[PDB]
């Protein structure tokens, strides 16, 4: 299998909806991130959240195709990244654009303990057709990077405890049962909503390095920290990469 480019890297994807909660969620997250900088080398990747839903509403009303909507959503993930990086700037953390993530991450992580980037991939006009909603979103972009780098982990920071058998905030939340552990293939066979992109399950099937991804509640201080040490504090997704 491929060599690992950055085997010592930890990748942390921050849900756009966590950022949407504003200071009440961002301030505790920033303090937890601050305390993690001396423990891990971090690539922090932000999702898009509700503003992407708004630009989809306008864009779809205008009839725009999926390759139009994809960079419009990616922009919102970039803005969350600028906000988060600014809160950590005094610690040496800056937001970096996708060409820098792709080609110069090693030198920047030699200079500083963490950088922030967009979790969305730069698919732009070349997003896949089929759905009118861009399929390769923040979870999918974060995982593609983490696996391509051969990183030590990818942790997904959500506004819920993990994956449930139905939307825990949706019309069927009375049936929602928590899944401590699941496989990408089992998830992919189900119908219904998930807190992670369905395309994430597709790129997990072709993954070469990352064996598990944990989805943890960023609204509970300490869970990101525990998850970065491999503690089980959310939903574990087995990717189907097997270990030695």
């Amino acid at each position: 299998r491929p060599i690992r480019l950055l085997p010592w890297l930890q990748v942390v994807k921050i849900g756009g909806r966590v950022m949407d909660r504003g200071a009440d969620a961002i301030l505790p997250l920033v303090e937890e991130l601050r305390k993690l900088l001396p423990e891990h080398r971090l690539l922090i990747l932000t999702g898009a959240g509700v503003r992407a839903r708004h630009v989809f509403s306008v864009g779809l009303d205008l009839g725009l195709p999926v390759g139009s909507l994809a960079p419009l959503a990616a922009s919102e993930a970039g803005q969350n990244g600028h906000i988060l990086a600014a809160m950590l700037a005094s610690e040496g953390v800056s937001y970096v654009e996708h060409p820098t993530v792709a080609d110069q991450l090693a030198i920047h992580l030699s200079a500083t303990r963490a950088v922030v980037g967009s979790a969305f991939p730069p698919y732009h006009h070349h997003e896949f057709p089929g759905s009118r909603i861009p399929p390769h979103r923040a979870d999918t972009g974060a995982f593609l990077l983490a696996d391509a780098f051969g990183a030590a982990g990818l942790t997904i920071v959500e506004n819920v405890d993990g994956i449930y058998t139905a939307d825990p905030n949706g019309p069927d939340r009375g049936q929602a049962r928590f899944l401590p552990e699941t496989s990408a293939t089992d998830l992919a066979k189900s119908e219904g909503p998930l807190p992670v992109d369905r395309a994430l399950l597709d790129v997990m099937a072709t993954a070469r390095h990352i064996e598990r991804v944990q989805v943890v509640n960023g609204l509970v201080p300490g869970r990101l920290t525990a998850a970065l040490r491999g503690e089980h504090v959310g939903t574990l997704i087995r990717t189907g990469v097997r270990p030695a």
Binding site: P65, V101, D103, H124, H125, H126, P129, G192, V196, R198
Partner: protein, 269 residues
């Protein structure tokens, strides 16, 4: 088809993975950005790598064609990309690294073709947004672009191996799909699809017209086009068939641009 208020409600409340939201978004209006434009791919290995004897006659057809058609002309990569992939694959590098190597070769070919067309006013366009396309298409009816998708390190790998599965076929096809173009023509060095590689099978049967599902049934899924393109074609909203033509035969591109069947037509269904 549902409603604006219900799509809006769903977009604000549900995960984008919610099938109810997915179905409502599927009912949105469909705008074609460049409905009068045609995307053509000029083969890397099949055409540009062949040099003057292949490229110069096709330059003439392009110059003549842009009086009647609006052309987005994408380039393949070809044998230098195959060499980079061999070196990099041998080093254990992943598809996301190889993708950037293939992009540079398609860039080279676009620059070479573009320099042959520059005196006709036809530019090479690039950058994430392809910002120069609308003015150029309106004014000189043609643009040249590099055919690799911009996925770079975020390239989706194939199920086996590190060769990037989305290359210049996919890059050209997806632009035709994104802009809602009226057709997609792949210019290669054979008349079209055969039952086997016509270069290495002396009695291969020419196939003028085929569906994606029949190509897969015949084991031709990765013969004349990159195999993901056939799945992209079945997912496409705007370009539901493509035509592959022999660019070494004078007039094939010109006739295909006019809508004539001169090679192989591949249809989604």
């Amino acid at each position: 088809a549902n409603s604006t208020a219900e799509l809006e409600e769903l977009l604000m409340q549900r995960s984008l993975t919610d099938p109810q939201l997915q179905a409502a978004a599927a009912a949105a209006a469909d705008f074609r950005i460049l409905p009068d434009a045609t995307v053509i791919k000029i083969g890397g290995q099949s055409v540009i790598d062949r040099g003057r004897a292949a490229v110069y006659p096709l330059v003439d057809e392009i110059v003549a064609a842009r009086k009647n058609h609006k052309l987005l002309i994408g380039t393949g990569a070809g044998t230098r990309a195959r060499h980079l992939y061999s070196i990099a694959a041998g080093l254990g590098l992943p598809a996301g690294v190889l993708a950037q190597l293939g992009s540079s070769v398609a860039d080279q070919n676009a620059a070479m073709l573009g320099q042959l067309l520059a005196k006709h006013g036809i530019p090479v366009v690039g950058g994430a947004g392809l910002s120069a396309v609308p003015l150029s298409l309106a004014e000189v009816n043609a643009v040249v672009f590099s055919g690799m998708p911009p996925y770079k390190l975020w390239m989706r790998p194939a199920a086996e191996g590190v060769i990037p599965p989305y290359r210049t076929d996919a890059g050209c096809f997806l632009l035709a799909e994104q802009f809602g173009c009226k057709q997609m023509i792949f210019v290669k060095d054979e008349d079209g699809l055969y039952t086997a590689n016509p270069k290495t099978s002396k009695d291969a049967t020419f196939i003028p017209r085929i569906s994606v599902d029949e190509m897969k049934a015949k084991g031709l899924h990765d013969s004349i086009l990159e195999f993901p393109v056939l799945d992209l074609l079945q997912s496409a909203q705007h370009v539901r068939e493509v035509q592959v033509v022999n660019g070494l035969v004078p007039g094939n591109l010109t006739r295909a641009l006019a809508g004539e069947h001169v090679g192989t037509i591949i249809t989604a269904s």
